[PDB]
Amino acid sequence: PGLFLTLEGLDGSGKTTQARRLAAFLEAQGRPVLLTREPGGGLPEVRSLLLTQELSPEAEYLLFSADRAEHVRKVILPGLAAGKVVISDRYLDSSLAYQGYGRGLPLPWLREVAREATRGLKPRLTFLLDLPPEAALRLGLEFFRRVREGYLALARAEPGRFVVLDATLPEEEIARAIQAHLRPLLP
Amino acid sequence: PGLFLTLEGLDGSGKTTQARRLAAFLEAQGRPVLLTREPGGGLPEVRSLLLTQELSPEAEYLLFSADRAEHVRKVILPGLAAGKVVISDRYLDSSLAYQGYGRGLPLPWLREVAREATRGLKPRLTFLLDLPPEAALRLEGLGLEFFRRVREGYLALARAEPGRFVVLDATLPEEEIARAIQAHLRPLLP
C-alpha cells in the first residue's frame, strides 16, 4: 500500500506551501499523510553542517546521499508500509538538478550512487514548480539558470513521473491542478 | 611528483603509531612530509556524523566518502603536487574492509562511489598491520564477528593487489615494524 509523491523546484518556488496544502487536502479525504523533506529528514546534522559550509560538489552530493539513505530507511519506507501517502519536499531530483546540472557532476555516476542509497525507490508522481530564478519568492545567477533548465530537462525525459506546474500562478489554482493530476491515483 | 603512502589495519593494530614514526623518519632524511588521516582529514565534522545512532551501512560509507572526496581534493592531491610524501592513516581500503567485508555492502558499488570520490588516486604502497581480531578494541556494533570479517577482508585485498600491499605482523615490536616499513620504502626514495 502507500503512495510516494515528491515536490521539486528552486528555493522559493513554493514547494513547502504546496506540500502543506496537499497534506491538508488528503487529510480532508481521511487519507493518512506524512510530510517530510530533504535535506534533514534522515540526518538533521547534514542540513545544519551544509548551511554554514561549502564543500566540493562531490563531497556535498555524498552528504545529501547519506541523509537521503537514512531518510529513505527511517522515515519514507516505514511511512509507505503503514499505507500513508508520503510527501517529500525535495528528493533525488534535487541532487540531479543542483549537483548534476548546476555543479556539473556526471548524472550516470549520481544515479549509480543513488541506487543503493534509495533502494531504487522512485516517487509515483513528482511535481515540478517551475519559474525563472528572478521570480523566486524566497554562484551568480547563471548557476540558478542551469538548475532550472536541469529540472525541465529531467521532466521532459520522464513525462510520466513529472508534472510541470507554472509556479507564478496563484497558489490556490496551483493546488487544484496538483489535486486534478492526483485524483486518478485515489478512489 | 610526490609519493602517496597509507597505513591500514584493525583498530588497535599500530597504524597511528607507525604513520607518525614513518613521518618523523622521512622528515629526518630531509624529505617534505604531509601526515593526514581518515575520517576527518577532508571534513573534520564527519566524525560527529559517523557517531549517529543506528546508522545504516550505506549512509555510513557515504559519510566516509564525503570526507574522502574533500580529503583528496583539498589535502592529498595538493600535497602530492608539491612533491611531498603524503601519508594517510586509513584510506579507501578501510571502507572496502569495514563497509564491504564487515557490513556486507557490495564491493562494486563501493568502488563505483570511490571512482569520483578519489578520482582514481591509489597509494603507491599500503602498509597493512595484520592484527588478530580478538586483540581489536567509535562505531555501531563493533563486535568480534565483525572484526573477523574485516581482518580477513584486509588479507583478501592484500592478495588481490600484492604489489601495493605490504602485510606486516602487528604483534611484532614497534621498532621491528618500523624498520620493516622503512626497508620497503628504500628503493622508492632516492
Ligand SMILES: Nc1ncnc2c1ncn2[C@@H]1O[C@H](COP(=O)(O)OP(=O)(O)O)[C@@H](O)[C@H]1O
Ligand atoms: N607492536 C606493538 N605491540 C604492542 N602494542 C602496540 C604495538 N604498536 C602499538 N601498540 C599499542 O597499542 C595501542 C594501539 O595503537 P594505535 O597505534 O593507536 O593503533 P591504531 O592506530 O591501529 O588504532 C596503543 O596503546 C599503542 O601503544
Ligand SMILES: Cc1cn([C@H]2C[C@H](O)[C@@H](COP(=O)(O)OP(=O)(O)O)O2)c(=O)[nH]c1=O
Ligand atoms: C576511514 C574509515 C574508517 N572506518 C572506521 C575505522 C574506525 O573504527 C573508525 C575511526 O577510525 P580511526 O579514526 O582510525 O580510529 P580512532 O577513532 O580510534 O582514531 O572508523 C571505516 O569503517 N571506514 C573507513 O573508510
Ligand SMILES: Cc1cn([C@H]2C[C@H](O)[C@@H](COP(=O)(O)O)O2)c(=O)[nH]c1=O
Ligand atoms: C535535497 C537537496 C538540497 N539541495 C540544496 C538546494 C537548496 O538551495 C537547499 C535547500 O535547503 P533548505 O530547504 O533547507 O533551504 O539545499 C541540494 O543542492 N541538493 C539536494 O539534493
Ligand SMILES: [Cl-]
Ligand atoms: Cl508509490
Ligand SMILES: [Cl-]
Ligand atoms: Cl519552496
Ligand SMILES: [Cl-]
Ligand atoms: Cl527518483
Ligand SMILES: [Cl-]
Ligand atoms: Cl598490486
Ligand SMILES: [Mg+2]
Ligand atoms: Mg539530502
Ligand SMILES: [Mg+2]
Ligand atoms: Mg543520493
Ligand SMILES: [Mg+2]
Ligand atoms: Mg528524468
Ligand SMILES: [Mg+2]
Ligand atoms: Mg588510530
Ligand SMILES: [Mg+2]
Ligand atoms: Mg589504503
Ligand SMILES: [Mg+2]
Ligand atoms: Mg569512497
Ligand SMILES: [Mg+2]
Ligand atoms: Mg582472506
Ligand SMILES: [Mg+2]
Ligand atoms: Mg585489493
